[PDB]
Enzyme design. Sequence first.
Site, mmCIF file in Angstrom:
data_model
loop_
_atom_site.group_PDB
_atom_site.id
_atom_site.type_symbol
_atom_site.label_atom_id
_atom_site.label_comp_id
_atom_site.label_asym_id
_atom_site.label_seq_id
_atom_site.Cartn_x
_atom_site.Cartn_y
_atom_site.Cartn_z
ATOM 1 N N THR A 126 0.850 -1.186 0.000
ATOM 2 C CA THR A 126 0.000 0.000 0.000
ATOM 3 C C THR A 126 0.889 1.240 0.000
ATOM 4 O OG1 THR A 126 -1.881 1.077 1.068
ATOM 5 C CG2 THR A 126 -0.187 0.124 2.499
ATOM 6 N N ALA A 148 -2.326 -6.530 7.675
ATOM 7 C CA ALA A 148 -3.548 -5.887 8.144
ATOM 8 C C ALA A 148 -3.899 -6.285 9.574
ATOM 9 C CB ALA A 148 -4.708 -6.218 7.198
#
Lengths: 212, 92, 229, 234, 241, 208, 118, 203, 197
Positions: F9, F57
């Site tokens: 990301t 995550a």
Amino acid sequence: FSPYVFNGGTILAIAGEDFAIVASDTRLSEGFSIHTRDSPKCYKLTDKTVIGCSGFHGDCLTLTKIIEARLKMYKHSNNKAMTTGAIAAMLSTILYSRRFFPYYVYNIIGGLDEEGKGAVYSFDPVGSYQRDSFKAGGSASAMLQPLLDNQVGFKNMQNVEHVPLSLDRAMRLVKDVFISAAERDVYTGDALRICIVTKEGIREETVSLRKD
Amino acid sequence: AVEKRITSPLMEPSSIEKIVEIDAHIGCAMSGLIADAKTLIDKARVETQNHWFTYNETMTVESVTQAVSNLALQFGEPGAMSRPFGVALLFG
Amino acid sequence: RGYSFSLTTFSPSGKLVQIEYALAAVAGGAPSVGIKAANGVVLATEKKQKSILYDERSVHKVEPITKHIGLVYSGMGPDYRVLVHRARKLAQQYYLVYQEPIPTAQLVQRVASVMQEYTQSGGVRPFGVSLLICGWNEGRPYLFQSDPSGAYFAWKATAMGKNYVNGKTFLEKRYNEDLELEDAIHTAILTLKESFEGQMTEDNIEVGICNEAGFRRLTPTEVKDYLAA
Amino acid sequence: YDRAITVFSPDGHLFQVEYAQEAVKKGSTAVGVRGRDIVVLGVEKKSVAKLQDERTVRKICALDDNVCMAFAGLTADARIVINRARVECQSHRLTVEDPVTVEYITRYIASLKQRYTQSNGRRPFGISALIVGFDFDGTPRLYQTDPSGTYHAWKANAIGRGAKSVREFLEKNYTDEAIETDDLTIKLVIKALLEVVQSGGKNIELAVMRRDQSLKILNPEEIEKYVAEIEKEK
Amino acid sequence: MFRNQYDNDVTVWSPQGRIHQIEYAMEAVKQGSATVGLKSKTHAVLVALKRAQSELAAHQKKILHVDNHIGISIAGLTADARLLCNFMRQECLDSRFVFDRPLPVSRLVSLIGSKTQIPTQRYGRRPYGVGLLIAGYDDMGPHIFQTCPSANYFDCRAMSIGARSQSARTYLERHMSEFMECNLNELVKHGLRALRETLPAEQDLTTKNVSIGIVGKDLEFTIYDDDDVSPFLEGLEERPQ
Amino acid sequence: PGIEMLHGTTTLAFKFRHGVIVAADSRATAGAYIASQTVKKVIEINPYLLGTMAGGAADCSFWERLLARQCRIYELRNKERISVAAASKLLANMVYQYKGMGLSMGTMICGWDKRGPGLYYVDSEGNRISGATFSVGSGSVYAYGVMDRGYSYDLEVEQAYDLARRAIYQATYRDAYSGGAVNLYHVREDGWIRVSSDNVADLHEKYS
Amino acid sequence: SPVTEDLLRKGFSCVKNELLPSHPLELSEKNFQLNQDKMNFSTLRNIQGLFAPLKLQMEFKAVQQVQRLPFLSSSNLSLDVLRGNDETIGFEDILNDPSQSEVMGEPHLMVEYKLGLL
Amino acid sequence: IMSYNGGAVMAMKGKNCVAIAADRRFGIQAQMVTTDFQKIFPMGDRLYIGLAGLATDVQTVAQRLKFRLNLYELKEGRQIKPYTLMSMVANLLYEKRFGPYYTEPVIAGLDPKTFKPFICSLDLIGCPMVTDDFVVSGTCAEQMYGMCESLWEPNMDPDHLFETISQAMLNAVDRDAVSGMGVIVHIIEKDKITTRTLKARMD
Amino acid sequence: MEYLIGIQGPDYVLVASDRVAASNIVQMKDDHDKMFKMSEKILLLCVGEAGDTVQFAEYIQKNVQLYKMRNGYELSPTAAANFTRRNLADCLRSRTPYHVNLLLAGYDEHEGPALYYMDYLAALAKAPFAAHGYGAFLTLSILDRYYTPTISRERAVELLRKCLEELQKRFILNLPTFSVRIIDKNGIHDLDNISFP
């Protein structure tokens, strides 16, 4: 030795305005053979919350048998019933408790919020919840989702208005999508078991699907 | 409303605080012995914050009174205690 | 006295009642005599097995340790075998390391510490026993005596045991150093004779020498020869 | 009904704590007062003993570059508590890069004291502390522990035997004017300590602490000069 | 008066031979409130009573919850009540998790007795002070098992262990014939009438001092309180005399 | 099992005279299939700090939750707000406790306190470097250059917002994992305030 | 697998390799007396009855709590003839004898840890 | 593994005289960081030890041995006989037999009572052995037995002993990359210790 | 990787450094002081694996202040070195595959200055001028060529400047600017940073 094996399955969840729907095909298949054709994959937890658990069918049972026990403990302790907003965090904690020996499951939670509202959560094998609106997933995923993306939330369409989802449309869409996606996938088919839930309880539903 | 009974004028008024925060919506008024009340308050704070982290919601006053009473029940025979907690609380 | 009955409390004068009681107990036992001479040492004692129903073999008092250390008790019978076994284990433990036999002094210090360790604690009685041990290291003879609390002394002619004051008084006018074992054995026999309540027999003396050969224990017929002579 | 810590009395009155307090009220005195930016921690020495060396026997121990310490009572227990407090201060500084506040360390000391009152197999620590120091925000702070479990953010209190008289003297003279400059605080604390002691200067020790200048004891010459200056009363 | 030296602890036998601590605990359990434990062919009502600390305060809880098919009462010390109901709940949950059948009462009560038997032997521990009236129907008709301060549990048909209750026992024994064939309402009426004898004269049962709890054939264990208990407490004739 | 989530990301944060600004994307990939489009990554722990997300995550979410609990406990105990450095070191110790078992996380804890701003950085490796300009994740590059070229430490508010939007858009146009939405966060004396959310398509249309 | 739910006192020990045994003669050397006692207890409980292991282990517990305080060397004269190792000298006392410990802890900390208060 | 650093030590027994010599070098593989790094430790007065091998374990074993020697000397009263240190180091090395150290110590000294020269040696994990004429151990072990066997001679006076220990090292250690650049010679005669520093090729 | 050097002298233990950070292909920060401080007379340079360096230095630094604060006086450089080596060895062998290099410093009041070189297996030398990192290879010969046994403080800076110029000209990496600190019998003096435009 390998403490993992696949068993297929498929989970789809539509969170409308005042109704949550969880549906799943029913076929336990490993390797190349078929074990059974009933094998329901939609278990009830409370009067207003349904859990769908795909993935390996050796932990799909253990998590189901642990969540109900912890729910009973919470009800006895705090003298209430867990809402759908807490089961997500509780299951995430349980899932992350074994980050070094991960559970091979793909769970989906659907239910009603404090007020009449649709809500469908979504996890990952390591365990990390995230609120969604039409999230599906499982073994035969990546085919169910794009059609729903096209239909439920109008994307890449112009000069078209927005209409809320009606209950009559939801089942008609789910049956069509499963019928379309059963042919091109190997692990799906057999019987389809639907668990539409509203603010009066749980009413159940079963239809044929590419008879095998 | 809890009195203070300051021993001497030189003692700073805010040094002693019978009223004590437990969370954003719970307060209690200790009495009697002080250190034991401090231990109970610390345990209650730890418990409520742990529950918030686990189940991701707010406390219910009965659900914390039960916890603190269960902790205080351990009088008897391990950092276990040996005397009853000579304190009293007014959870609100 | 309330301050008594427990070995972990000091009386309000400075003492330990239990330790003194154990010392009196070990004083009330069986006489034993040890003589140090310029050539060697001799340890003499007598047994309570007077009746012929007993046996000469089996149970025995002066148990040797390794090859240069020999002891003798003057206290409670069933309360020094464990101590003797610990002493032998300590000697072997020292022998595996430091590939050379134990000197006497280190063994005395270790056994004294292990004996004292049941004094400072709370809830276990002190050992009722007091034992002499004789050694022969670096061309020198060594003699020591242990106390129930534990305090070794470099004694020379101790006659500790029952009626030990008379033995000390008798020995304080006979020993004159520069002697061989021949006269030392006779002196020890006379010291035992001074307080024996009867006459010495062929099966009442367990003398053991520690000359520069080892820790030979005199055979009963050899003891008979010396007793006659 | 006073032979074990865990037991109570027919009315209450946990008695081992009260007996420990009585034992604490037997040692040398101790005082302390904060000003604008100053703190004093004077104590008094019971006996001279010219053969003995004052270097080893002392009460004003250092706990950190911003926290100091003065006790009263049995020496060995106080030394143990100070050692544990030093270790805890260093551990907290390691676990968080921030100089430790006074309140945290005094709470730790109070908790350590209180822990030894929960089983009839360990006697309580009979001592009393006068934790005082400068925080990281610059606000002067002062505290006072207690054998049982308690602590208060006092201002100019005192401990030890004969503490009522010195406390009354301090409360009858403490005003904002006397805490304005630096040497005024020294004059006030010397006047306070001069009451219980027979003759000043002989057996009185001070420890002036400034803003981040670390603890600094005072030599006898400066003490004599300050006493002479304070002797100009009319 | 030859008992001062033989009652300070629990691990000593009197010259006659009897543990005095057990008798003292059995006498202690009589501090509380009455609790009738009637049973029938299909349902096992469990009616209790509640005291009042003051008019301003609220009453204590006397009918706890254990599982979907079992519910216990309480009488005596309120301290060990929770400490023992925790063990109750944990055993029931473990039996539901390992196997897949409700834990029968006949094994649960034996386990509770086995646990409570331990403290009466080892030193430095004291017997519990509860008066449990475990009730619940699992597979072979409802059961009513009583527990004493000593680990000596009884089977029963109907009894009222607790506070002043001998008159309650007499009334419960006089009418111990119709309890085999009656509906829920008649059984509850009999239970309340039996409890009314315990309450002193010129005193009636209000809405805030009854805790009727019912477990039977097709309904899980539910506790009734506040105005919800009014429909059961309607007829009750008019007065004991 | 399968790849958990979020193979990579992007995010960035620079500080200037009016606080600290945080920007992030939202695309939690799973190797080669897009799992979601609107996953929030700027994690809120209290109305004074702003936790960030990168790497894995679940690990990031769990450790921010533990950090939030510890910060709340410290707040309740010492009656005083905790500085950013203390929280950063706490998280550093907790993450460094486990190393080599597969942990992977990049967080950029930032906020306002008594010493002003602060934007300390910690990751699974264990270093606790500070700075005044940061960007982590797969899409950190392709944005580092632009946001370094534009930064001047004397910018206004709207100019800084435009700079952040341009940097994120140019990073996500060239990469293959970033994209979706753009979240913009501001920090001041009275805590953070959410600035705005935007879709990549509209920014591309208006920047064409 | 536990979360935090003082690092200077106990630090510098990564979680990585305590759940990763060293040279295979690790669990057979770190825990040897315990394993031998467990095997003997199991054998006696199987062949002689349930009384012997209970009695012997509670004798062990009774004799264990009369030694000196943990921050000093323990003679352990007793419990040895009862254990059965009265003369079984081996690789337990000649190598790294605990009397000459190379590193030593604080007295109060060690005794309070032995009590299990921490 | 005794190549991450360098080292070489001998020991010759003469006529009431013992000589021990070492080589001064400490470097990380090809690189070199210093020229002075002691490998001879003065344990006792007329006794010495000659640790040689991996340095990071040499320091630790020297410290532990010095600690235990001080303990024994203080407790038992009088000095330590040379044979005792042999079993000392044997026990110390076998302490970690499974987690082996990296040292090949050499012990050389005199009896404080008899003044009879004594020399021994040790392997990696502790295996006592005594050779009358000489012994040698180190990284360059192979290229010293040939130099020493022919040049040796029984019943040597101190001067010839020093000459032989100098000639068996100075031109026999330069035939190797590592473990060079300096030689320390320790000669221990009956009454006084003497230390000398040779000069060798600076390469 | 990084760079650490230190030159001895008559009454100084002058040390340089390299204010720089590290990442995959990026330089996160261009000024990261590696020079942890022990006391008023002791420095501690440390370059190694990321995280473990800043943890070990922090642990070994909040342990020397304890000794001063518990005994009044201050440690000596030799004791500090023989303690740091022991801690590093015991901790590295225990359970952690560390990789840290250290370079102690210090000036006591009895024997001049003292500079210690330590590798990652916990060795201890007393070289008069050592180096770390990769620039050691290209710069140690330059340091050895001009190093007179006695060097004035004025000339030490010039020698360091030449030794850093050669590294900045013949090295692959981009060490942009260096820090300089010199210790005398007055505390920890500081000098202006060395920055190459």
